[PDB]
């Protein structure tokens, strides 16, 4: 009596904690530095407390290279999930920064690339709008649910792994660009026409145009254009989230 076998409880509560905390430190909104560290650790601990008793406990000792392989596996799974989720916000940030750069908002990058003078304020605006939308669509709950679900697909125990699958996540790097182009497209094109229009004005009497009349007009036009274009991101926001989620579901397995 008075056994309280500690190794069994430790091995039951450790690896799910490692995977949950690995997701927490990288998953969007759950990985933002504004949350105190203890809150994140407690959330991981409580989620593991809820989940672990149902799972089959592992018996590999913590003092073995098998434990290191397990820890590497959990870290890989968590960071892969969090990063694949982060790709959508990366795409939204790209689209916003490009709309802002076609605004002429930061012209110093065309002359001094990476010269400590850059303000992608539109990128930040649409990034926080995307975060608000993600909060509204309860994406984080889904993330937690999928973190739990990847066990049935991929159990804690060391399992063999595949290859082109990693490429898929890396190939998801294309989406950030591909979807970004579309969001812009609904505005950059008209801005392009505006610039074309300015060109027609410069084909008249030489000089006396551009850098003096083009910038304010194009700034105001970009502002009101994409202010009107704001209602458009939400369907595209859901499209981006669905793309990331089903890509994750297909490739994680």
């Amino acid at each position: 009596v008075t056994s309280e076998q500690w190794l069994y409880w430790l091995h039951l509560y450790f690896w799910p904690l490692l995977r949950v905390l690995a997701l927490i430190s990288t998953a969007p909104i759950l990985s933002e530095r504004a949350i105190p560290k203890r809150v994140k650790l407690g959330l991981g601990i409580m989620i593991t407390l809820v989940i672990a008793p149902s799972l089959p406990a592992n018996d590999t000792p913590l003092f073995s290279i098998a434990a290191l392989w397990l820890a590497m596996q959990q870290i890989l799974i968590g960071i892969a999930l969090g990063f694949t989720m982060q790709f959508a916000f990366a795409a939204v940030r790209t689209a916003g920064e490009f709309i802002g750069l076609q605004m002429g908002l930061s012209f110093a990058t065309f002359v001094d690339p990476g010269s400590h003078l850059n303000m992608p304020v539109l990128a930040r605006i649409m990034d926080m709008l995307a975060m608000l939308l993600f909060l509204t669509f309860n994406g984080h709950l889904w993330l937690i649910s999928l973190l739990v679900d990847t066990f049935h697909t991929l159990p804690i125990g060391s399992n063999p792994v595949n290859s082109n699958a990693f490429m898929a996540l890396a190939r998801a790097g294309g989406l950030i660009f591909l979807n970004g182009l579309m969001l812009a497209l609904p505005v950059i094109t008209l801005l392009l026409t505006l610039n074309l229009a300015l060109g027609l004005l410069n084909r008249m009497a030489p000089q006396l145009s551009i850098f003096v009349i083009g910038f304010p007009l194009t700034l105001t036009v970009g502002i009101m254009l994409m202010a009107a274009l704001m209602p458009l991101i939400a369907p595209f926001c859901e499209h981006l989230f669905s793309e990331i989620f089903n890509l994750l579901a297909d490739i994680v397995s």
């Binding site: 409580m46 809820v50 012209f107 304020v121 926080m128 003096v212």
Partner: protein, 209 residues
């Protein structure tokens, strides 16, 4: 009941988890996240020093959790101190008002998700939800609410920077940093519209609503 040595041991051990209660079961998380986000918004990452914001958050939490603490004291601490309720029942009696306060501010979606993750049976009413389901549901709801509040907080301070950059760009001053100009104007705004009274009242209502 337990022996007096066991009661003293349990009391001393339970005194350890006070930061955990403050962080994961109390109104502290939303307020501290909102304060951190607001400090990130104004462009002064070291302005109200962390200790000042922590003290303000502690006082706000003490003012907000007052009815819950009062109910715990009148229902659990008072009978326990008068030797009417045992030590192992005062905890159970006092965990109920805190559970109710955590429930009201939580969200259905989180509750449904964490009721599904535990493989528990159907919960027809809120009276069947245990603490093992309410704790992380409340934590997630508080995190989401704090982030929503902070992200709607962030908008005007970025609007000002946007208009500042556009105005600077109209005149061709493309090499002037916009952040350095915008910071005094952001401070001026936060001074003008009662920056703190409105935020304090909004957070307090956000709890009592």
């Amino acid at each position: 009941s337990w022996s007096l040595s066991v009661q003293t041991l349990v009391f001393i051990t339970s005194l350890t988890f006070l930061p955990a209660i403050l962080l994961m079961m109390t109104s502290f998380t939303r307020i501290i996240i909102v304060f951190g986000l607001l400090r990130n918004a104004l462009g002064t990452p070291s302005a109200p020093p962390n200790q000042v914001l922590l003290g303000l958050a502690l006082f706000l939490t003490f003012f907000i959790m007052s009815p819950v603490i009062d109910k715990i004291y009148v229902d659990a601490y008072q009978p326990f101190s008068e030797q009417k309720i045992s030590m192992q029942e005062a905890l159970d009696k006092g965990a109920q008002p805190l559970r109710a306060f955590m429930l009201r501010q939580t969200r259905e979606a989180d509750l449904a998700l964490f009721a599904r993750l535990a493989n528990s049976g159907p919960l027809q009413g809120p009276e069947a939800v245990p603490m093992r389901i309410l704790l992380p549901a409340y934590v997630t709801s508080e995190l989401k609410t704090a982030f929503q509040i902070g992200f709607t907080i962030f908008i005007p301070f970025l609007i000002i920077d946007l208009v500042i950059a556009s105005v600077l760009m109209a005149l061709g001053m493309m090499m002037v940093p916009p952040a350095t100009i915008a910071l005094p104007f952001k401070l001026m705004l936060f001074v003008l519209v009662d920056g703190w009274q409105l935020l304090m009242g909004s957070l307090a209502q956000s709890f009592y609503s």
